[PDB]
Amino acid sequence: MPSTFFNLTMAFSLSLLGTLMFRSHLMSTLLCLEGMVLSLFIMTSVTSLNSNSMSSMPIPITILVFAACEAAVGLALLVKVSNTYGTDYVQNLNLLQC
Amino acid sequence: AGRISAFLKNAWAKEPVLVVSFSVWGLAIIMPMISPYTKYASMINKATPYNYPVPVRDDGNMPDVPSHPQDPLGPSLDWLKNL
Amino acid sequence: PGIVELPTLEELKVEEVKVSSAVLKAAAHHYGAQCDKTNKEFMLCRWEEKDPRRCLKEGKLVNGCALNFFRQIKSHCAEPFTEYWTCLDYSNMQLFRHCRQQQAKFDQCVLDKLGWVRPDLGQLSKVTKVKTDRPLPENPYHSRARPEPNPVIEGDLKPAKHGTRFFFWTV
Amino acid sequence: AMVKRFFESYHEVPDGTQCHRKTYITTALGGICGIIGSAYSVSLNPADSTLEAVARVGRYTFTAAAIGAMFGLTTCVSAQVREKPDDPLNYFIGGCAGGLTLGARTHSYGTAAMGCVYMGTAAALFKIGKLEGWELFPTPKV
Amino acid sequence: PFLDIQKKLGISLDRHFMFLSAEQPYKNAARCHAFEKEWIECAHGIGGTRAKKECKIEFDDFEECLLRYKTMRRMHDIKKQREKLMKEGKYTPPPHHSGREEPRP
Amino acid sequence: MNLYTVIFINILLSLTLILVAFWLPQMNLYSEKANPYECGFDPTSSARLPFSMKFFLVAITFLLFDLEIALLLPLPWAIQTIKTSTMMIMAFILVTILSLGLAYEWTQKGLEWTE
Amino acid sequence: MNPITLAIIYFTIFLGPVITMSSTNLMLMWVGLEFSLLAIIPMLINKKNPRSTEAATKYFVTQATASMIILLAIVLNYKQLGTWMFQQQTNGLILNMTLMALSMKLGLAPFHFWLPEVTQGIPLHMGLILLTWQKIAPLSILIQIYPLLNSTIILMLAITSIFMGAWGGLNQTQMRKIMAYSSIAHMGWMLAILPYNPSLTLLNLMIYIILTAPMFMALMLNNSMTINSISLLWNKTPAMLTMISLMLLSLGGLPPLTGFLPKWIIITELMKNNCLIMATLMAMMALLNLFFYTRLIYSTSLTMFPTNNNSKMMTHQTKTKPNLMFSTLAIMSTMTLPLAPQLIT
Amino acid sequence: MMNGRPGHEPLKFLPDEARSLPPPKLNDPRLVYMGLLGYCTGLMDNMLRMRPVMRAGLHRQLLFVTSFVFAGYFYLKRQNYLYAVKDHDMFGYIKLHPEDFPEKEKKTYAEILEPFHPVR
Amino acid sequence: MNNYIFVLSSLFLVGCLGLALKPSPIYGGLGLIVSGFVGCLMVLGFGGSFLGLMVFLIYLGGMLVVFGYTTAMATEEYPETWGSNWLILGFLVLGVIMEVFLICVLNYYDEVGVINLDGLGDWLMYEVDDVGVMLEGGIGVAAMYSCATWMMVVAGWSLFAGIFIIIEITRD
Amino acid sequence: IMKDVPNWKVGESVFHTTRWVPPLIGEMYGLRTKEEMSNANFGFTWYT
Ligand SMILES: CCCCCCCCCCCCO[C@@H]1O[C@H](CO)[C@@H](O[C@H]2O[C@H](CO)[C@@H](O)[C@H](O)[C@H]2O)[C@H](O)[C@H]1O
Ligand SMILES: CCCCCCCCCCCCO[C@@H]1O[C@H](CO)[C@@H](O[C@H]2O[C@H](CO)[C@@H](O)[C@H](O)[C@H]2O)[C@H](O)[C@H]1O
Ligand SMILES: CCCCCCCCCCCCO[C@@H]1O[C@H](CO)[C@@H](O[C@H]2O[C@H](CO)[C@@H](O)[C@H](O)[C@H]2O)[C@H](O)[C@H]1O
Ligand SMILES: CCCCCCCCCCCCO[C@@H]1O[C@H](CO)[C@@H](O[C@H]2O[C@H](CO)[C@@H](O)[C@H](O)[C@H]2O)[C@H](O)[C@H]1O
Ligand SMILES: CCCCCCCCCCCCO[C@@H]1O[C@H](CO)[C@@H](O[C@H]2O[C@H](CO)[C@@H](O)[C@H](O)[C@H]2O)[C@H](O)[C@H]1O
Ligand SMILES: CCCCCCCCCCCCO[C@@H]1O[C@H](CO)[C@@H](O[C@H]2O[C@H](CO)[C@@H](O)[C@H](O)[C@H]2O)[C@H](O)[C@H]1O
Ligand SMILES: CCCCCCCCCCCCO[C@@H]1O[C@H](CO)[C@@H](O[C@H]2O[C@H](CO)[C@@H](O)[C@H](O)[C@H]2O)[C@H](O)[C@H]1O
Ligand SMILES: CCCCCCCCCCCCO[C@@H]1O[C@H](CO)[C@@H](O[C@H]2O[C@H](CO)[C@@H](O)[C@H](O)[C@H]2O)[C@H](O)[C@H]1O
Ligand SMILES: CCCCCCCCCCCCO[C@@H]1O[C@H](CO)[C@@H](O[C@H]2O[C@H](CO)[C@@H](O)[C@H](O)[C@H]2O)[C@H](O)[C@H]1O
C-alpha cells in the first residue's frame, strides 16, 4: 500500500505536468485530463478497499460519472474549435489578447 | 377521447416499437402498486441471514425472546415455506 | 508503550474437531440445535468482550460440545451419516439439494435413535437470549474519560451596552 | 530545512561584522529573485530562440545577483565604518547602492534615481521592521 | 456546511457516510472502526481547537491503526535484525517459520 | 494464477504464429509492391488527412449513456436490499431520465447524422 | 435555446453552488463545482463565433485542471484520515494545494490570466454571472476551512491580486476587461481577510456583487463594450450618468460610499492581528483602482465626448430598460454607509 | 466567530430568545433612513425610465418606501440580537476566567511622575 | 508474487509518463487503455472486482469515441510517436531513469515510510473477514440505490443535463 | 532475535490504548515464508 500510493500519486503528477505543458493538439491535453481521472479513481478505489469502507465505494463511481461529462463537454468544444480553424491546435485560440 | 383512438390505432400500425415501449414502461410502474406480493420482496430479503444473529444477554425481562432456537417464539418463516 | 499480553502455547491447547467442511455441513443443522447453549455463550462472550484472549475458556467448551456431538453420531448413526456427507462432498458448492435422499436417511436415524429434531427453516437464524453468570464488562473499549464540555454561560439577553459600539455611530 | 537555515545566518551576528558571509547571502538571495523573475519572463513573453531564452535568464539573474551583492556589502561596510549597527540609515545606503547598480546594468539614469530612492526606503523599512518586530505574514490572533 | 440546510430540515443527504465508523452495508465494520469511534466521541462538543490537544491520544492511535507507520517500522526492524544474524550464522528460524508446522486445527 | 497462465499461452500462440508468418515465406520486396492500395491507381493524398465524422454527436452521447450503464450494473446486488421501495424508485427514475434524455435528442434531430 | 434547455441549464447553474454550499461531504462539494463548470459552458458559447468558442475553451481547460487538483486534495485527505472532510490534522501540503486550485478557479493572481480574456469573449450578461454568482461556490468552500489555511499563501495571493488587478485595469479600454480586473482586485480583499474574519469576506463579496451587478446592467442597457461606446451615454441615456458615476466611485472605495466600508473594515481587522505591512500596501494599491475608475468617470459624466449623427434616431425611440432591480441595487450600493454597523455584525 | 456557539440553531433568522430584547422603535433613525433610501429608489426608477420624477407612479414609490422599512425593521431586530449575543458571550467569559482579566488599581497623579517636555 | 503490485503500479506510472509526453492522440489513447487495464489489475489485486472491471469498461468506450475524434479533428500528416522526436524520446528514457533513481533514493533515506522495497508484499491486504459472505465491492457500489441515494441523484442529473448541454454546444 | 538490540521492548505495543487490536496479515505472517504471505494476500483472489 505505501509503495502503491507513491507510484499512483506520481502518476497523477505526471499527468498534471502533461496538462500544464501544452503542445499542439488540444485533444492531447484532453487525454491528460483523463490520465488524472484514472489516477484519482484508482487511489480512491484502493483506499476504500484497504480500509474496508464499503460506504465510500459509491464515490469512485461518481468520479467516473462526473469525469465522462467533462470528456463529453471537452469533446463537444473540440468540435467547435475544429469547425473554425480546421484543426485543434491551441496556438490558434489567441484572438482574445485584444 | 375520440381522436385519441384514431391516434393510438395510427401509432400502433406504424410505430409499434414505441407503443410497446410506453406500455411496458407504464405497466412496470403499476404492477408493484397492485400486486399482492410486492410486500414479500422486502420480507424475503430481510429473512435471509447473512450476519451472525448475535445473542443478547438475558437480564430477566425478556419474555418474548427465545432461549433455544427451536422455541415456539421469535420470527418464523412459515409464510415463506408455504409461499 | 505497553507489552501485549499473549497466552502461552499451552493455554491454547484443546482437542481439535478435525473433520472436513462437508462433515460439518452435513451435521450443521442438528449441531446448531444441540450445542446451542454452549455455542451461544461463546458468541456472547466474543461480542461483549471484543477480545479473543478473554474467551479462551468458553471457546474450549465449544470444542468440548462439538466433539461430544460427533461422538454421539459415531456410536448410533455412523453409516447413515457417512453416506450423507460423502454425497454432500461431491458438489462443488456442497449444496444440500443434491442429497435430499441420503439426508433423509440420516435424519431418520438421529430422530429414532437419539430423538434429534432438525430445526425448521428460519430457526437457526433467530436471535436468542443466553443466561450466563459472567459479569458484564463496563468499559469494553478501554476508553479514557471524555474531556469536559466548555462551560455554558448563564443569563438572559440584555441590549448591547451603548449599542453596536462601532466607531462614531451612537446607537 | 537547511536552505532556510542559511538565510537566517544573516541575523545571527550584529550588522557590520561577518561582512562577506552577509554579502554572500544577499547575493544568493538576489539570484533567487532573478531566477524566479526569468521563469515568468521566458514563459509569458517567450524569446525567439532557445539560446536567446537562456541569455535572458543569465542577464536577469546576474543583474539580480549584482543588486543583492551591492546591497549586502554597502550595508555591512557602512554599518561598521560608522560603527552604528542598529541603524536604518545603513540599509538606506545599501539599498541605494543596490538601486544604483540596477540603473548601471540597465543603461538608465532614471532607474538609478528611482531605484536608489524606492529600494533605499524599502531596505530601511526592512531594518525598522526587525528592530520593532513587525511581521509580514502574522498568524490569526483575533 | 455553509448553509446548514440538511441540519435545518433534519434530513441527511450526505451526512451519514462522512467517516469510517459510519454505517456499512450488512453491518460490516470498517478497518479501525474502534479507534475512529473513540476519536470522534472524544472530540465531540469540545470544539476543534480543544480537540487538537485534548484528544491527541485518541487521534494518534487512530492514525496508527489507519496508516500503520509504527507497525511497519517495527516489523521492518525485527526482520532486518534477523537478516543480520542469519548472515553471520547465529540463528536458524524455527520449523514453524520455515514451512513445516503442524497445522491447526 | 491459472487466469494468467491461460492468457500468456494465448499470447504466445498469437506471437508464435506471427513469427512463422514472417520468417517462413520467401519474400521479394520492391517499391511498387509495398505501395498502398487504391483500386489500381496511385493515391491522390495521404490517408492521414482529416476524415469528417458525421455522427459525432451520437459519439459523445454514447459516452453519457455509457456511464449510465455503469450506474445500472450494480442492480443485481441492489435487489438484495431491505429498502426495496427505495431501490426500485431510484431505478425507475434513473432509467426514465435516460429515456427522457434520449427522447429529447431524438426529437432535436440529434440522432440524425450531419450532412 | 428552447425553454426546456434554459430550464435545465439555468437550474443546473443555480444547483451547483447550492450543492457546494449545503454539503458536508467534500466529494459533494466537488460535485457542485462540476455542475457549475459544465452548465455555464453552453451559456458562454451561445453566440457561437470565433471569440466565444476560444473563451469557452480557455475556461474549460482552466477550470477542469483546477477541479482535478481539488479532487486530489479531497482524496489524499481520505487516504490520510479516512474521512471526507478537512480536519485540523489534515496534512499541510494538502491544504495548500486546495488553496492554489481554488484561487485558480476564482481567478486570483497569479492564476488570473484566464479571467480577463474569458470575460472579454462572452456576452455581458454571462460576464455578470461569471464574475458574480460563479464566485460563491469556491469561496464557500474556503470559508469552511479558514482555521486551517496557511496565511502566508493567502496574503501573497491577495497582495498579488490587488497589484495585478490594479496594473491590469489601468491599461484597458475594453469595459469587460475593466470588470475582470476589478474582480481580481476585489477577490484580493476577500481573500486577504479570509483566515482572520471570514464574515468580512462575505461582506466584501456581497458589496462587490451589488456594485458589479448594476454596473453590468448599465453596460447592458446600450450594449457598450469600450470606453468610447460608454462615452456616448450623455446622448443616449443621460439619466444613467448620476448613478454610473457613484457606482464607479463606490467600486473605488471612496468615502462616504458603501464601497469604502469593505476596504476600511478589512484594514481595521487586519491591523487587529498586526498585519500592518500587508494592510498598508493593499490600501496604497487600491488607490490605483480609483485612477482608472476616475478616468472612466471623466469620459462619461464629467465631459461630453463627440457624438455621431445616427444617435439622433436612437433618441426618437423608446427603451423598456433598465428594470426595477437596477435602481434598487444602485442606491443600496452607494448610499448605505450610514448603516455600516448593521452590515458588519 | 460566533458560528458554532451552543444552542445556535441553523438558518434561524430571529431565534426565540431575541424576543426578550426591546424592539426597534418604528421611527428609528435607522429605519427612517431606510424609508428615504426607498423613496430615492422610486425617484431614480422614474429618472431612468424618463417619467416625471416625483409625480409619476406613486403606487410604486409607496411600495418602495414600505418595502425598505418593512425589511429594515426585521433586519434591525436581528442585528440587535446578534449584538446582544456578542456582549452576552463576552461578559460571561470574563466571569468564567477572572484570573485572565484582573482588576487593576491605577495610581493617582500625585504618585505618578509623568516626564515633562518643555516647549521652548 | 511479492513484487506483483509494485510492478503493476510501476507500469501504471509509465503509461501516464508516455501519456504526458503527448504523442499523436492515437497513441495517447493507447496508453490510456493499457494504463486503464493495468489500473484495473491493481484494483483486482487489492481485492476489488466490480470497481476494477468498470473503470476498464468505461475507458474502453471513451477511447473508442476519442479515436473517432482523432481521425477527424486531431490528425496531421505525420503523427508523432514516442520515438518520432529525439527530444521526447529523451524524456521518456530519462523519465524511467528518474523513477529508478527516486525509488532507490527515497528508499535509502527512510527505508519504511514511503517506499519499503525491503517489505514489498508484506503490506497489501491489512484485514479481511475470513468467514464473510457479503463483501464484494458490488455491494458497496450498490448502496447508491438504498443508503447513498443522494450520490445517484447528482450522478443521474449530471448525465441528464449533459445531454442538453452537448446538444446546445454542438448545435450549428 | 532482538536480545542484543539496545532499547527494544519485546512484545511492546504501538498503541496507547490497551484494547485488543486484531493483528494485520503483515504482523501475522511476516516472520514466515513468502509463500504463506502470498497466499494470504492473493489466495482467495487468485483462486479461479
Ligand atoms: C525529467 C524526467 C521526468 C519525466 C519528464 C516528462 C514529464 C512530462 C512532461 C510533459 C510535458 C512535456 O513538456 C513539453 O515541454 C515542451 C518544452 O520543453 C513543449 O513542447 C514544445 O516545445 C518543444 C521543444 O521545441 C517541441 O519539441 C514540442 O513539439 C513543442 O510542443 C510542451 O509544452 C511539452 O510537450
Ligand atoms: C558614487 C556615486 C556614483 C554614481 C554613478 C553610479 C550610477 C551610474 C548610473 C549609470 C546609468 C546608466 O549609465 C549610462 O547609461 C547610458 C544610457 O543612456 C549609456 O550611455 C551610452 O549609451 C547611450 C545610449 O543609451 C548614449 O546616448 C550615450 O551617449 C552613451 O554614453 C551608459 O551606459 C551610461 O552613460
Ligand atoms: C526641492 C526640489 C528638489 C529637486 C531635486 C532635483 C534633483 C534631481 C536629481 C535627478 C538626477 C538624476 O537624473 C535623472 O535624469 C534622467 C535623465 O535620463 C531622468 O530620467 C529620464 O531618463 C531616463 C534614462 O536614465 C529614462 O528612464 C527616461 O527617459 C527619463 O526618466 C530622471 O528622471 C532623473 O532623475
Ligand atoms: C534590495 C532591497 C531589498 C530590501 C530587503 C533587504 C533584505 C536583506 C535582508 C536579508 C534577509 C534574510 O531573510 C531572512 O528570512 C528569514 C526566513 O525565515 C527570516 O526569518 C524569520 O522569520 C521566520 C518565519 O518563517 C521565523 O520563523 C524566524 O524565526 C525569523 O528569523 C529572517 O529573519 C530574515 O533575516
Ligand atoms: C421523474 C421520473 C419519475 C418516473 C418514474 C416514477 C417511478 C415511480 C415508481 C412508483 C412505484 C413504487 O411502488 C411501490 O413499491 C413498493 C415497494 O416496491 C410497494 O411497497 C410495498 O412493498 C414494500 C417492500 O417491497 C413493503 O415494505 C411496503 O410496506 C409495501 O408498501 C408500494 O406499495 C408500491 O407503491
Ligand atoms: C424558461 C423556464 C420556464 C419554463 C419551464 C419549463 C417548461 C416549459 C414549458 C413550455 C415548453 C415548450 O417547449 C417546447 O419544447 C419543444 C421540444 O421539447 C419544442 O419543440 C421542438 O421539438 C419538436 C419535436 O416534435 C419539433 O417540433 C421541433 O424540433 C421543435 O419545435 C417546442 O417548440 C416548445 O414548445
Ligand atoms: C431556480 C432557477 C433559477 C433561474 C435563474 C434565472 C436567472 C435569470 C436569467 C436571465 C437570462 C436572460 O438574460 C439574457 O438577456 C440577454 C439580454 O441582456 C439576452 O442576450 C441577448 O444579447 C444580445 C443583445 O442583448 C442579442 O444580440 C442576443 O442574441 C441575445 O442573447 C439573452 O438572450 C437572455 O438570456
Ligand atoms: C515497467 C517496469 C517494471 C519494473 C519494476 C521493477 C521490478 C522489480 C521490483 C523492484 C522492487 C524491489 O525488488 C526487490 O524487493 C525485495 C523485497 O521485495 C528487496 O528485498 C529483498 O532483499 C532483502 C535484502 O536486500 C531482504 O530483506 C529480502 O530478501 C527481500 O526483502 C530486494 O532487494 C529487491 O530486489
Ligand atoms: C432542489 C434541488 C434538489 C431536489 C432534488 C433532491 C431531492 C432529494 C432526493 C434525495 C433524497 C435522499 O434522501 C435521504 O436519503 C437518506 C439515505 O438515502 C436518508 O438518510 C438515512 O441514511 C441512512 C439509511 O441507511 C441512515 O443511517 C440515516 O440515519 C438516515 O437518515 C434521509 O433520511 C433521506 O432524506
- Residue reference for cell 446582544: H84
How far, in Å, CA of G58 to CA of A26, rounded? 11
How far, in Å, CA of C2 to CA of C5, rounded? 9
* 3-state SS, one letter per residue, for G193-252: CCCCCHHHHHHHHHHHHHHHHHHHHHHHHHCCCEHHHHCCHHHHCHHHHHHHHHHHHHHC
Q: Ligand 7 within 6 A of G74 CB?
A: no
Q: Bridge-partner residues for I138, per DSSP?
A: none
**What's the gap in Å between the CA of J22 and the closest CA on chain C?**
9
How far, in Å, CA of D64 to CA of D101, rounded? 10
> Interior CA angle at G146 toward G143 and G150, to 5°?
135
How far, in Å, CA of J13 to CA of C3, rounded? 6
- DSSP secondary structure code for residue C129 in this structure: E
Q: Helix G124-131 and helix G133-143: axis angle, to 10°?
A: 10
Do chains I and A touch by CB distance (3+ pairs < 8 Å)?
A: yes
> What phi and psi values does residue G226 have, to the nearest 5 degrees?
-115, 170
Judge contact between G35 and I162, C-beta under 8 A.
no
Which ligand number lies closest to the CA of residue A3? Answer: 8
Indicate the SS3 state at residue I171.
Answer: coil
The reply to whether A74 touches chain I by the CB within 8 Å rule is no
Residues lining ligand 5, CB < 6 A? Answer: B 29, 32-33, 38-39, 41-42; F 84-85, 88-89, 92-93, 96
- Of the CATH numbers 3.40.50.2300, 3.30.70.1140, 1.10.287.3510, 3.40.50.2000, which one belongs to the domain with range A2-98? 1.10.287.3510
The reply to whether G60 touches chain A by the CB within 8 Å rule is yes
Question: Exposed/middle/buried for A97, CB within 10 Å: 0-12, 13-18, 19+?
Answer: exposed
Question: Exposed/middle/buried for E76, CB within 10 Å: 0-12, 13-18, 19+?
Answer: middle
Of G109, G98, G188, G201, residue with least CA distance to G150: G98
How far, in Å, CA of C123 to CA of A39, rounded? 48
Indicate the SS3 state at residue F38.
Answer: coil
What residues of A are in contact with residue I105 (Cβ under 8 Å)?
Answer: none
Question: Exposed/middle/buried for B82, CB within 10 Å: 0-12, 13-18, 19+?
Answer: exposed
Identify whether H87 is part of a domain: yes
How far, in Å, CA of D116 to CA of D94, rounded? 9
Atom 3 (ligand 5) nearest CA: F93
How far, in Å, CA of D37 to CA of F109, rounded? 54
Last residue before each gap in chain J (C to N over 2.5 A):
none
Indicate the SS3 state at residue C3.
Answer: strand
List helix spans (H) across I74-132.
86-108
Nearest atom within ligand 8 for CA of residue I11? 1
Burial A41-62 (b: 16+ CB within 10 A, else e): bbbbbbbbbbbbbbbbbbbbbb
Residue E91, all three cell numbers: 540463528
- Residue reference for cell 429498502: F83
Residue D57, all three cell numbers: 535568464
Atom 4 (ligand 1) nearest CA: I95
The reply to whether E31 touches chain I by the CB within 8 Å rule is yes
What residues of J are in contact with residue I122 (Cβ under 8 Å)?
Answer: 26, 30, 37
- Residue reference for cell 458536508: G24
Of I168, C128, A22, residue with least CA distance to B70: C128
Of chain F, the end-to-end C-alpha distance in Å amounts to: 52
Chain-centroid distance, C-alpha G17: 15
Indicate the SS3 state at residue H51.
Answer: coil
> In chain H, how many domains are there?
1
Nearest to G277 among D134, D140, D141 (CB): D134
Chain-centroid distance, C-alpha D73: 10
Q: Helix G133-143 and helix G3-22: axis angle, to 10°?
A: 20
Which residue range is the domain that position H30 belongs to? 1-97
Which residues have a Cβ under 8 Å from the Cβ of G5 and sit 6 or more positions away? Answer: G42, I164, I167, I168
Interface test with H, best of C148, C150, C153 (most H CBs within 10 A): C153
How far, in Å, CA of J33 to CA of E97, rounded? 7
How far, in Å, CA of I69 to CA of I26, rounded? 10
- Residue reference for cell 469557452: G56
Q: What are the domain boundaries of chain A?
A: 2-98
CB contact under 8 A, E31 and A51: yes
How far, in Å, CA of B66 to CA of B74, rounded? 6
How far, in Å, CA of C62 to CA of C43, rounded? 10
CB contact under 8 A, E8 and H10: yes
How far, in Å, CA of C38 to CA of C61, rounded? 7
Question: Exposed/middle/buried for H46, CB within 10 Å: 0-12, 13-18, 19+?
Answer: buried
Residue C162, all three cell numbers: 451603548
Burial I84-102 (b: 16+ CB within 10 A, else e): eeeebeeebeebeeebeee
How far, in Å, CA of D116 to CA of D102, rounded? 9
How far, in Å, CA of F16 to CA of F19, rounded? 5
Indicate the SS3 state at residue F35.
Answer: coil
Half-sphere exposure of D114 (CA within 13 A, CB side): 7
Q: Residue C94 region, left (φ>0) first, then alpha (ψ -120 to 50), else beta?
A: left
Residue C7, preceding peptide bond in cis (omega within 30° of 0): no
Nearest to A80 among G45, G75, G76 (CB): G45
Question: Exposed/middle/buried for D33, CB within 10 Å: 0-12, 13-18, 19+?
Answer: middle
Q: Ligand 2 within 6 A of D112 CB?
A: yes
Q: Helix G324-332 and helix G241-251: axis angle, to 10°?
A: 40
- Residue reference for cell 434616431: G313
How far, in Å, CA of A39 to CA of A50, rounded? 16
Identify whether H81 is part of a domain: yes
Residue H112, all three cell numbers: 505618578
The continuous run of DSSP H or E covering G129 comes out as: helix G124-131
Judge contact between G106 and G187, C-beta under 8 A.
yes
Judge contact between G297 and G288, C-beta under 8 A.
no
List of chains touching E (3+ CB pairs within 8 A): A, B, C, G, H, I, J
- DSSP secondary structure code for residue J5 in this structure: S
Q: Beta C129-130 vs B56-57: how paired, if at all?
A: parallel
Judge contact between H104 and H56, C-beta under 8 A.
no
- Residue reference for cell 542577464: D59
Residue D12, all three cell numbers: 545571527
Of chain J, the end-to-end C-alpha distance in Å amounts to: 39
* D50 Cα–ligand 2 center, Å: 30
Judge contact between C2 and J13, C-beta under 8 A.
yes
* 3-state SS, one letter per residue, for chain G: CCHHHHHHHHHHHHHHHHHHHHCCCHHHHHHHHHHHHHHHHHHHCCCCCHHHHHHHHHHHHHHHHHHHHHHHHHHHHHHHHCECCCCCCCCHHHHHHHHHHHHHHHCCCCCCCHHHHHHHHCCHHHHHHHHCHHHHHHHHHHHCCCCCCCHHHHHHHHHHHHHHHHHHHCCCCEHHHHHHHHHHHHHHHHHHCCCCCHHHHHHHHHHHHHHHHHHHHHHHHHCCCEHHHHCCHHHHCHHHHHHHHHHHHHHCCCCCCCCHHHHHHHHHHHHHCCCHHHHHHHHHHHHHHHHHHHHHHHHHCCCCCCCCCCHHHHHHCCCCCCCHHHHHHHHHCCCCHHHCHHHHC
Nearest to C155 among H80, H81, H92 (CB): H92
The continuous run of DSSP H or E covering B25 comes out as: helix B16-34
Judge contact between I15 and I34, C-beta under 8 A.
yes
Residue G65, all three cell numbers: 485542471
> What phi and psi values does residue B64 have, to the nearest 5 degrees?
-135, 40
Indicate the SS3 state at residue B56.
Answer: strand
- Residue reference for cell 436471535: C127
**How would DSSP label each residue in F39-89?**
TTS--SS-TTS----TTHHHHHHHHHHHHHHHHHTTHHHHTTSS-HHHHHH
Atom 20 (ligand 4) nearest CA: D8
**Resolution to 1 decimal place, in Å:** 2.8
Which residue range is the domain that position G231 belongs to? 2-344
Residue F26, all three cell numbers: 520467401
Residue G124, all three cell numbers: 455581458
CB contact under 8 A, H11 and E8: yes
How far, in Å, CA of J25 to CA of I122, rounded? 8
**What's the gap in Å between the CA of I134 and the closest CA on chain B?**
7
How far, in Å, CA of H39 to CA of E44, rounded? 51
Residue G25, all three cell numbers: 461531504
Identify whether H116 is part of a domain: no
Q: How many residues would you count in chain F?
A: 115
- By CA distance, what is H23's nearest residue in C? C159
List of chains touching H (3+ CB pairs within 8 A): C, E, G
> Interior CA angle at C77 toward C72 and C81, to 5°?
105
Radius of gyration over alpha carbons of chain F, in Å? 26
How far, in Å, CA of H41 to CA of I170, rounded? 43
Residue E105, preceding peptide bond in cis (omega within 30° of 0): yes
Of F73, F60, F50, residue with least CA distance to F105: F60
CA distances from A67 to C20, F64, G17 (A): 50, 10, 19
Instruction: Report, in this order, helix, strand and coil percent for chain E, each rounded to 5.
Output: 60, 0, 40
Residue G129, all three cell numbers: 454571472
Judge contact between F71 and A58, C-beta under 8 A.
no
Of G155, G167, G156, residue with least CA distance to G289: G167
List helix spans (H) across C16-142.
21-26, 28-32, 36-49, 58-73, 78-88, 100-114
Atom 9 (ligand 8) nearest CA: I3
Residues lining ligand 1, CB < 6 A? Answer: A 14, 17-18, 21-23; I 17, 20-22, 85, 87, 91, 94-95, 98
> In chain G, how many domains are there?
1
Residue C40: how many other CB atoms lie within 10 Å: 23
How far, in Å, CA of G190 to CA of G199, rounded? 10
How far, in Å, CA of A52 to CA of I135, rounded? 9
How far, in Å, CA of B58 to CA of G150, rounded? 56
Residue D2, all three cell numbers: 537547511
Q: Ligand 6 within 6 A of G1 CB?
A: no
Q: Bridge-partner residues for B56, per DSSP?
A: C129
Atom 23 (ligand 8) nearest CA: I118
How far, in Å, CA of C39 to CA of C30, rounded? 13
Judge contact between G239 and H47, C-beta under 8 A.
yes
What residues of C are in contact with residue G340 (Cβ under 8 Å)?
Answer: 166, 169
Residue F88, all three cell numbers: 426500485
* A49 Cα–ligand 9 center, Å: 25
The continuous run of DSSP H or E covering B57 comes out as: strand B56-57
- Residue reference for cell 448605505: G336
How far, in Å, CA of B43 to CA of I111, rounded? 54
* E44 Cα–ligand 7 center, Å: 48
- Residue reference for cell 544573516: D10
How far, in Å, CA of E18 to CA of C145, rounded? 25
CA distances from G342 to G208, H22, H37 (A): 17, 17, 15
How far, in Å, CA of C148 to CA of D80, rounded? 59
Q: Which of residues 27-86 of E touch C (CB under 8 A)?
A: 34, 37-38, 41-42, 44-47, 50-51, 54-55, 57-58
Last residue before each gap in chain H (C to N over 2.5 A):
none
Residue C42, all three cell numbers: 461463546
- DSSP secondary structure code for residue A38 in this structure: H
Indicate the SS3 state at residue C56.
Answer: coil
Residue H24: how many other CB atoms lie within 10 Å: 18
Half-sphere exposure of D71 (CA within 13 A, CB side): 31
Q: Does domain F2-115 have CATH number 3.90.1010.20?
A: no
Identify whether H110 is part of a domain: no
The continuous run of DSSP H or E covering G97 comes out as: helix G92-106
The continuous run of DSSP H or E covering I152 comes out as: helix I149-170
Q: Bridge-partner residues for G226, per DSSP?
A: G174
Q: Bridge-partner residues for E19, per DSSP?
A: G83
The continuous run of DSSP H or E covering C130 comes out as: strand C129-130
Residue C124, all three cell numbers: 437457526
Residue D73: how many other CB atoms lie within 10 Å: 20
Which ligand number lies closest to the CA of residue G321? Answer: 7
Judge contact between J45 and I47, C-beta under 8 A.
yes
Burial F84-95 (b: 16+ CB within 10 A, else e): beebbebbeebb
**How would DSSP label each residue in E46-81?**
S-HHHHHHHTHHHHHHHHHHHH-HHHHHHHHHHHHH
Q: Bridge-partner residues for G174, per DSSP?
A: G226
